[PDB]
Amino acid sequence: AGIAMKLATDREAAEGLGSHERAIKYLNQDYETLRNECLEAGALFQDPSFPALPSSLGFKELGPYSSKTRGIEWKRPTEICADPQFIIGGATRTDICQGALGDSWLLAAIASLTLNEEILARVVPLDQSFQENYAGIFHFQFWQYGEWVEVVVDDRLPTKDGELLFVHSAEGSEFWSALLEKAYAKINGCYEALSGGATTEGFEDFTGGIAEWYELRKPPPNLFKIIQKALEKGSLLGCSIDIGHAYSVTGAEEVQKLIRIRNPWGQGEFWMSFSDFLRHYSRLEICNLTPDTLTCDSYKKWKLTKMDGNWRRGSTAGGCRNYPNTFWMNPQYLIKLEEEDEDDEDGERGCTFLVGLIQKHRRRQRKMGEDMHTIGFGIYEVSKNFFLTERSDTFINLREVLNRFKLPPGEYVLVPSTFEPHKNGDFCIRVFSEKKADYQTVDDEIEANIEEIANEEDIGDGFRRLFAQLAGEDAEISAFELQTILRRVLAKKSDGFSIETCKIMVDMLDEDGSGKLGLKEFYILWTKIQKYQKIYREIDVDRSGTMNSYEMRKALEEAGFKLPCQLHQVIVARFADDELIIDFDNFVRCLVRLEILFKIFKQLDPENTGTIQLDLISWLSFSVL
């Protein structure tokens, strides 16, 4: 925990940890290890971090003491089938079904998977079985808000009267499907979490793709071309009718307008009018693959970019153009296209792209699609942009919000947010586009420009007597001597610098190396302090004795500093009180450490490499002193 952790993880991700080739070991569990361990011991696997107990079932509908979970017998594949198989190839259809417990969104998600190898495999390692190095363990790979996470489960599946209570094929022989659902429950905390699920989400987590989705009631014009264009790129589509069986869409050719409709629980597809479509089905869901999903040598893929961000109450949580005091404070991004979508009818000048903003897991989300803020973004045509900032709107409260665009080449700025300001969250924005697009972050570069005041001859003759008559016997003031004095020029706006502050004050300007302030140094302090009161003065437009969090950005700039949004979050989280207020004592204390923390760096970094190198000892000293 703490910052040093996120930083290590961050560095790890930048080395590829969390990419499909190097997925994150969920809970730090590794499949090969634990498997081998169980093999050396001639035991079958028993997962400690999601045992065959109530825990893994539910907390409310599927809770402990709940009758629905009373008298479940967890049993392993060998104990409900003579010959358990992981997966059979040839698969031309599906017969998965749901047990008496267990949401039916899994049907369609799993059904989509069983009709593309390259897909399935991306989430279900094929090298797996009951006949090879079997030890009652399996493993899967899910996509999680932008990165991949490998989850491991022991095979015991839940059953009442020897009937599987969840996802399970009707034949009764192939176990992979039931075992995938077990691991997905796992990374969501328990089966019951999967209760209200959406198929686009879990299908998103089974693929790494992005779901684009249309209430047929109110289709857009140009849909058929969208249908057709997805099928070329390779996207799984899925349609159905609202109360309820899921079908997909496998083709979309003119002759007339006509799209072919498959049903995986059949062995096969069938033609139907696009117009009849519109009329028999009520949803259409499209799921666009990342370009590294299929290895089709020229299948034309999406070009993908993604980035990660945060909102934090007090600094970065602004959002919605409805709130112009703060909207500009959200984190900003620049999307810049070049090759317009190539010609055919359309209309131009069309670089086509998908924008997705997904919201990362919050610590109270016990179940799918619950406690999901309202989120949204703006795009704008052409340093952090100010208040003087092309579709925007459509601010839904789903886990992911998405909008398809086609806009002229050039530069655009994306600003994602929540609808009302002040809500903490993380997010990932991905952009899939026809041609190479570019992404860059736009924010203030880090910059400490502090005016080098001084001291030169003169120095108030009043100054002079003043410090001597204050230093006492040594002609030096301590953080303490200093403490009380300032408390005097102070109470007579504020109730004194705290004692910690005082101390850092002294740390900054000591240099004598002695813990005490000479005459010259106590005049620098004093001028900086006066400088801090000025700045603090103006920001306190409202002349309230206090400053709101949201104003530090600006404050800090007048004090000669420019930071990026994450450093801004760290200041308000560390220097403000609930209610987003920063007292005058905090404020300067902040600004002093920040001056010191930059100094130490440029000095250890005199050639400006952009990085400094420290050994425990030197770390402990600088870092605390």
């Binding site: 930071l563 450093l567 989280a573 450490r593 990085t611 425990l616 402990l620």
Partner: protein, 176 residues
């Protein structure tokens, strides 16, 4: 499945935050200024807010100003050790440790540096009297702990060195 203690606090958690399970500084300040401020088995007014804000910071990896329960649990556990090391060195039960005991109490605490650093830490957490109240003794150990944990996190391989760009340097030192 956890020390009856932790599962009680937990109440104080669920009361204050619900399913969020997290706690502000000042909220968490209270909770601590209760188990340890009532008891005359130990002299101390209470933990400072500042002291308190730090506990949260070094243990917040999401930069939200909240201390998660799991993290709370790590903190408390060392907090109760460092309780051990406190009393064990506050002979006079003054509500301070006199200067000359600290370096024992510190080495006691698992952290072993030299004279040169203790001649600084002491010189920076003590009072004019050169003695460190409990507040300070704990606050320090909280830091030291986290700057040590920070380095391990940034040296996963073995070099006994870390290299930080500027953003890393200020995240790691401003949130501390």
């Amino acid at each position: 499945n956890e020390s009856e203690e932790e599962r009680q606090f937990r109440k104080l958690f669920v009361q204050l935050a619900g399913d969020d399970m997290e706690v502000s500084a000042t909220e968490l300040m209270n909770i601590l200024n209760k188990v340890v401020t009532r008891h005359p088995d130990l002299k101390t007014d209470g933990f400072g807010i500042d002291t308190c804000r730090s506990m949260v910071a070094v243990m917040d990896s999401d930069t939200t100003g909240k201390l998660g329960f799991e993290e709370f649990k790590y903190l408390w556990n060392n907090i109760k050790k460092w309780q051990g090391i406190y009393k064990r060195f506050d002979t006079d039960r003054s509500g301070t440790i006199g200067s000359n005991e600290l370096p024992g109490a510190f080495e006691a605490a698992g952290f072993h540096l030299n004279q040169h650093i203790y001649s600084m830490i002491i010189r920076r957490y003590s009072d004019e009297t050169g003695n460190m109240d409990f507040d300070n003794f704990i606050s320090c150990l909280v830091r030291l702990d986290a700057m040590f944990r920070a380095f391990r996190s940034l040296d996963k391989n073995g070099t006994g060195q870390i290299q930080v760009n500027i953003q890393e340097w200020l995240q790691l030192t401003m949130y501390s």
